[PDB]
Design a binder for this molecule. Structure first.
Ligand SMILES: CC(=O)N[C@H]1[C@@H](OP(=O)(O)OP(=O)(O)OC[C@H]2O[C@@H](n3ccc(=O)[nH]c3=O)[C@H](O)[C@@H]2O)O[C@H](CO)[C@@H](O)[C@@H]1O
Ligand SMILES: CC(=O)N[C@H]1[C@@H](OP(=O)(O)OP(=O)(O)OC[C@H]2O[C@@H](n3ccc(=O)[nH]c3=O)[C@H](O)[C@@H]2O)O[C@H](CO)[C@@H](O)[C@@H]1O
Lengths: 157, 157
């Protein structure tokens, strides 16, 4: 209960990692791609003296082992410790996501048996219910990195 | 062991996160900024069926809670599970690191109220011992992102 927990999630390529880095610039301890089942371990570590963390941000998304799209089990276990996480959900238009993948030349996490476009759509379907529980949805369709820096500063300042 | 473990460390700005993304693109499960004490929890998680992970990469650096510069405890604990981690150490020339900090407009993790160059020199001093224990040292002074993909692919593909 003595640690602010932020969960950063959302569409791949919408800026999860960039948003994580902004939080780091603001003084948050950021852990990326922690499996849901291990968040209680991380929170207990943060509460122990000597290794104390007062502001913890975890990036959890389609890559995270055992993440299915619902944070209910995560929210349940965190509540037994008097913690209510703030969930930030990154998204962007299909057109912006496609452009970012063409520019980086990375594979989409759900691409392989389907196209890049089909992977984006499958991720949108997977995450629509958790999106509706996010405390903050940030749409990066036309945001620069500096614009994301300002949006996050405004919400975590 | 039952899981291959790679620890990615090195100088801030030398490409730790970019190297981690290449491993992710090659099929590795990548967790960034895990406290050293939680390495055993992640390995145990990856060894259980239902949450199996055969190739695990962890980024651990000056940001990681409890990381002092040595990987002695980590190597000791991993040994209790018959795992020998491979350590990858990212570095670059001072000039390249400074240019990357100017271009990305972020602060160095060890800068404090000191200058950028003071932060870089402090980190080089902290990490020189663990650098000597690295299985692979990657110098990114003149590497593009494409060059680093090729380098990592040759060492891990
Ligand atoms: C397109 C892409 O790289 N997707 C990957 C990226 O997603 P992730 O969602 O983490 O995307 P990043 O934070 O890397 O941002 C991707 C790109 O968008 C830019 N950007 C971001 C936010 C913003 O407001 N404005 C802006 O211009 C960034 O500068 C970068 O060029 O890393 C994940 C973790 O390895 C991978 O699973 C994703 O497949
Ligand atoms: C300069 C910078 O941003 N440093 C931060 C970066 O370090 P980290 O060491 O993770 O650096 P990144 O992987 O973000 O790479 C830094 C920059 O160098 C480029 N690059 C990288 C490797 C390569 O071979 N060639 C190349 O040109 C990347 O495209 C990027 O522009 O993220 C860490 C985690 O938040 C922070 O602690 C560091 O302060």
């Amino acid at each position: 209960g003595g640690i602010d927990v932020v969960l950063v999630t959302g569409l791949s390529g919408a800026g999860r990692g960039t948003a994580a880095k902004v939080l780091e610039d603001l003084g948050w301890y950021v852990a990326d791609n922690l499996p849901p089942q291990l968040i209680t371990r991380m929170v207990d570590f943060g509460l122990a003296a000597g290794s104390r963390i007062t502001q913890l941000a975890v990036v959890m998304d389609v890559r995270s082992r055992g993440f299915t799209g619902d944070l209910d089990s995560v929210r349940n276990e965190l509540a037994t410790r008097a913690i209510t996480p703030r969930v930030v959900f990154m998204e962007a238009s299909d057109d912006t996501l496609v452009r970012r993948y063409e520019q980086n030349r990375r594979s989409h996490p759900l691409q392989g048996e389907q196209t890049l476009a089909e992977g984006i759509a499958a991720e949108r379907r997977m995450l629509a219910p958790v999106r509706a529980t996010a405390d903050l949805i940030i749409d990066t369709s036309t945001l620069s990195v500096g614009g994301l820096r300002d949006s996050i500063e405004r919400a975590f300042g």
